Design a protein around this ligand. Sequence first.
Ligand code: MG
Ligand code: MG
Ligand code: MG
Ligand code: MG
Ligand code: MG
Lengths: 427, 427, 427, 427
Amino acid sequence: MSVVGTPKSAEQIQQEWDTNPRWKDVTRTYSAEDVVALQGSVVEEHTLARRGAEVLWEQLHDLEWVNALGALTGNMAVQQVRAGLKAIYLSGWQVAGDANLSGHTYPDQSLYPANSVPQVVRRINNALQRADQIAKIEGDTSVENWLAPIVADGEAGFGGALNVYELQKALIAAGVAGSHWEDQLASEKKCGHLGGKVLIPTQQHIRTLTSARLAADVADVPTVVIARTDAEAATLITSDVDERDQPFITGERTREGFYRTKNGIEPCIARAKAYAPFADLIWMETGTPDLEAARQFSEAVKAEYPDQMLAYNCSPSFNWKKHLDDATIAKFQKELAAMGFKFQFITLAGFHALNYSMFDLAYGYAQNQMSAYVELQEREFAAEERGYTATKHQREVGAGYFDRIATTVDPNSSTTALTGSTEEGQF
Amino acid sequence: MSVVGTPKSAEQIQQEWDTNPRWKDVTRTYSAEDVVALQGSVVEEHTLARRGAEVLWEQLHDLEWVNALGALTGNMAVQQVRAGLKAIYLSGWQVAGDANLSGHTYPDQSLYPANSVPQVVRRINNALQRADQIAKIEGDTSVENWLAPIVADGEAGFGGALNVYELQKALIAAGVAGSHWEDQLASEKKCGHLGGKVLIPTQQHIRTLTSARLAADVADVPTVVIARTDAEAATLITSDVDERDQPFITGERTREGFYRTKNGIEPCIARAKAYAPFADLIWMETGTPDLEAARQFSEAVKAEYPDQMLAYNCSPSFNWKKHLDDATIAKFQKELAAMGFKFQFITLAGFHALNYSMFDLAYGYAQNQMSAYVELQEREFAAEERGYTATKHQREVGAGYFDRIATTVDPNSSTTALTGSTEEGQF
Amino acid sequence: MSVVGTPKSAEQIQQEWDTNPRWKDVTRTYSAEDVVALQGSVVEEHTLARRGAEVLWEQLHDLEWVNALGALTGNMAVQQVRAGLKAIYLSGWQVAGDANLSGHTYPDQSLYPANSVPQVVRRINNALQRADQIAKIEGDTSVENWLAPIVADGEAGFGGALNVYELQKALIAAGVAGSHWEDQLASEKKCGHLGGKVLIPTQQHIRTLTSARLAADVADVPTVVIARTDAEAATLITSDVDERDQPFITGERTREGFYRTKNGIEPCIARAKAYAPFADLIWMETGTPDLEAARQFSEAVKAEYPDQMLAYNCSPSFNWKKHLDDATIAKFQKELAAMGFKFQFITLAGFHALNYSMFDLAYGYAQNQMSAYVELQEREFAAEERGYTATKHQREVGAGYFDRIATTVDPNSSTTALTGSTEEGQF
Amino acid sequence: MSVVGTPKSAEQIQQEWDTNPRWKDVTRTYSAEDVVALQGSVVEEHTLARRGAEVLWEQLHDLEWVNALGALTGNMAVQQVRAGLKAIYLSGWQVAGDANLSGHTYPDQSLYPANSVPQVVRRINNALQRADQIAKIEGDTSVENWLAPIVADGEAGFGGALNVYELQKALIAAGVAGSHWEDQLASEKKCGHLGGKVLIPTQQHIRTLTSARLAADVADVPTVVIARTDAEAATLITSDVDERDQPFITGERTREGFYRTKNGIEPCIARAKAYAPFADLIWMETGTPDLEAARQFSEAVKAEYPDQMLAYNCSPSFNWKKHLDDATIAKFQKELAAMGFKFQFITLAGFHALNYSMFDLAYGYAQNQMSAYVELQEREFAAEERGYTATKHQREVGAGYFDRIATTVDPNSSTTALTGSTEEGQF
Ligand SMILES: [Mg+2]
Ligand SMILES: [Mg+2]
Ligand SMILES: [Mg+2]
Ligand SMILES: [Mg+2]
Ligand SMILES: [Mg+2]
């Protein structure tokens, strides 16, 4: 036998919950003994999840606010970090659209296999690790921490409390820093800005949030748990069993058996308060980018919970200039941070940048061929003064790093890559 | 017992070989009976592989030339077709860098799992199929053919003839139209524009081209087979056993057992000639974008095989404006076309478009937050006159197509997505 | 543009629904035109799905009955067919237990990723195809059909109607012949012999059966659709919306909002009758093997639907000796077949055979080392008289088939595998 | 900003290499600073790989010998440990045959995707972890260590030194304890007991072993590195470049350029000695299970390398009773153990166990239906005396464990699985 990965005792775990300020405003309805009972004889260490979660928590407290863009590939996350961004957002919508394990293009309705997001978390972490390895051998100290924390989409958990548990565990195994969970019926899940949304009862989402925390505790990592409510626009709910939901129930039913419910900020606020003890961050989806509406939500929840941090989705599902002038747009995130919205993210940033940049290049290329590509390459060259490095694509993906591996195994290797390359001679 | 998928007879196959103009200049050193014995009692129909290969072959003869850009995600290929391109190039380098089944970022050295490119082939077809389905329910006739032919990188085959066979079979099952195969040692494979390259003997590559043809024949599809030679810059070869290679052997050997060999256009020309009976297209990697060297290579091959189509890599591994003036860049592809270069491609187009667009957005975002994203969204709106559609990301990704499935199953469904979406109300 | 895989006209499909006996007893609530609307410009052929479904249907009408054993690996399926079986069962329980895409061991509660069963379907077809390729090379006419139809577990569809649709589509792409769908809540799905089952409303299961059929129609293949009811033991239902369900609802609720419902054969019979127009086979999960209960169910259904075929789970979750005697155990399937149970299967056969054989082997090995193994080898030699071939393991996994590919490419290869093998010299 | 996962200093690594008896006679031709240079800013902890490798190294010394059977599924490994076995062997031949990521059935020729064995390593560890978790909840302490060390097949590394590096790294991420590497040309790899084998030069294999050690060092885990030579039967070698290989070169060549070499125990002992400073265990492939040949190989090695442990493949490719008597067969492993073979394993145990046990059942089932199955269920019942537990399949697979998760999350949950089960009532 062995002591490696020996689980902590329940008293040690209790001590930590009582001692670490991380757990100041955090309610667990299960016991430390319950956690240990689920741990077996060996607890795998999850370095990147631990490191990420701790970094993320400090950033939410140390910065004015943390903003992120949705990344759907590893290289996308690398560029975000290279450009000075300090956190990464992993969008389930983007995974459905262009990066899931079925191989298919889907709308955002939880259609893809449930291990799809964990795979992209692991991909993003691998890509940042490579960027980190390359920087080290290059003596590049331009970025202090390549392993920026990742906050990923847990959707509606793909089923019940057990599905939620397995997803959080998978996300942790892959190195996630934070995960979010929404109070929608999993079998009818929608993007927050699609219609046809169905809520589940308040208590059912507390079970989800409890389940997400249990998985993190059993995995012995301080995963940041975010609760999201879709009650601003959802006109349906699965059941009227929960007394907290009954005030918005209208009596009318649909043919499927769903109850109609009165949507808006009011049930969002009540839901936020109920989730607060079980959420590190709280997020309500909205129909418009509106600062007053955000202030309204923020005030009401902080009245009850002064230190409860909030999250906001600066969604590309909004037509921004339709609703806001350049001046409000420019100050949007700053104002939001003043209200307690400490995590802010553009969910579909990667989808749009990728689709637009390839459309633009392919269109020019269709008309003018190489002239069109040369314009991009020249922009890349120009971008180097900003810190862009990917013009030299070979070193960017690690040709220099694997040369070092190769010469470590055999210094006189005849088959190394960078020496004699066009990159060496032309860039 | 059934007659679904029953194998043809050798006689039928032979007739096909004798009379189909597709096979005019194709040498097969195995028998039609050999093919049949490999087919068991059922042959699966590969619709996309068949359709793609037939469309590709006609475009090569119908169009002045077929050009393409490297796609590494499904959405990229969609935007390329939407912008008017008629074929998709699937780059092994890009798969190594940002889209392979290990989840890691790699340089272009055949490090990733051998089913990686096939998986991307299937993804790209899935994505094109989605765009096709959406076009049909939207009444969108702007794109003539959504299922553009995919030409994919078979690298050095990941081993010997059998690994080659299995890779070609997997590409076909995934629906590939064409595949290219290079005369390097698989265990030391490099991007053409990296150094450290090791050639295999001429006959070993003829064996590769034979295996790739054989897999296509057994799968019963007219897959376009592309032969690539890396002799312009490789200074090593695994063996001097082949008399056609001996004139360039120097005599010196490395510690690995590799022979030094004289690189340049001369051994490329000879190899291209030995490969011609086994290749629908021939491609030589070169160190610069140069019409004269292209002309030189084209002239010499055509003098011996007048109907031999060629392929040219318009590589991002070149510093284009360091080597050419804007006038020469503007005419490059049409000039190449005139010489017989019928398939032309920018291998790493995807990697650069993706990396540069995200660096630029993230950089802007870091300084201006929402102002930076809105500039992109506005550029997207502006692009609609050119044919861009992804600004409406919900329908782009099939929300309307799935709503159609939903209402087909249940016309009274209360939970369809687009009705009441912010997309519908703001776009 | 091309003719390959062009979709049929609505008129043509209608013609088939009208005139093909296959659809005699089949209700479709959507139209032929709805099917065409969803097929885009190109319809992929699915040879193995078509062949298997056609073959399965014929067998259901020819043989007294069709039985099968649950297979979780490809070799297992190969051996089942070798041993003379005519169909393969693909258990979701077994996939959860030992063959799903998360890599984890799960209980049967829809915990694993939704593309796990399609991947095993594809695996089993690949394995059978290799067995079929090898036979055609060894001139083995022993087995008449290596491509036995596969019937696969669709569970509760992993969510809503769209999740169901996507599962069926992926099952078909992998070459499934038939699929079964059960009337449970997916977020709380259970093995039928587990407790805590929650039913869905009758109409919701008709929605599922409809979705499964629609995916088959869109994919243009006559997949066998199987309807399963879990009403014998389930005491919970999600809603009281459906009038057909209301007679069993007690009026008592749970804290989650579920409704208590009266379980037993009576609701199973009512549900079966409701599912009948949408199901090629109907299957009632039961708590004990009981020829009497089976006849009761069988007679009640046939009274309304005389030609409705049924299916029966001979479940290892039963203690067979606690309930029955040797004489009846021997007649069991034959008697069921006379009541109209035309498809019969042992769900967990593979789990038990694999787990037991390995335990027995390992146990002996621990105390007796090589003696224990040598014994297994002897039985394998013995079993050769009954048709077993796996003792010559090299040729069993295709060493000779691949040698043939190798010599097809190059007859003079010095790197063939079987020549010089210890299989050639010791066997 | 974090110090979690900060790598050790060169000096600390150096100290471990100097003083820790683990690294006693281990040559590393690279430096401690070379290792650190490759580690980036963060080193991920690999709990199961560290634990397994440490445990395995101890067992190899504390125990008389360590023996193992090839496992190819997770359940298979659980039954091996349950039966008292102390280590698990992961066969590449078995992955090729029935458990690789292409989904196809293959002969043992390195045809499958290179990440296939790592996936089975992860699966096996997951399976053992589940069993550990259940046993802890059931108070079963009959197995002291559920997480038995896993020794895995690295084959010929799927290419060059960098492919070896990545395979070893993936094996470690998955939790491997040891890995073996053979001196064949990957592009022509064969199972040891097939023919058509090709050796690579001695120094090339040293490169392989050095790369495998480097990956383990960079990953900071004491992975057990095993070298295998295939020189006993191989009559071919890629090159005559290595002077240690020249004595066996005959001078004859093939049309492929390979060199004919004299096979036998002679080059095996020479290669064993060359590999010894780079291998924790040495393994020689034999034509027959002969104790005398093993004595001859062993003695020759210990005379120069006294502490060098050895490994032996008790292979099903041998017809065992065709060579040995029941008296020797029974003493075989004990005898080998004396000679210095502390690791012995049956490569294809799982294959034969699986294929036979399922052919047996399916064959009975085809004649006798349910009678055949109950025969099996009766044996499983009979085995609960020896410790067999899979009869109660629900608990075996985690039903009780997930019930505990469910009740921890919500003690009032009315949808738990075991209460009301047939397992709770019939077993
Ligand atoms: Mg989302
Ligand atoms: Mg809180
Ligand atoms: Mg390439
Ligand atoms: Mg099932
Ligand atoms: Mg092996």
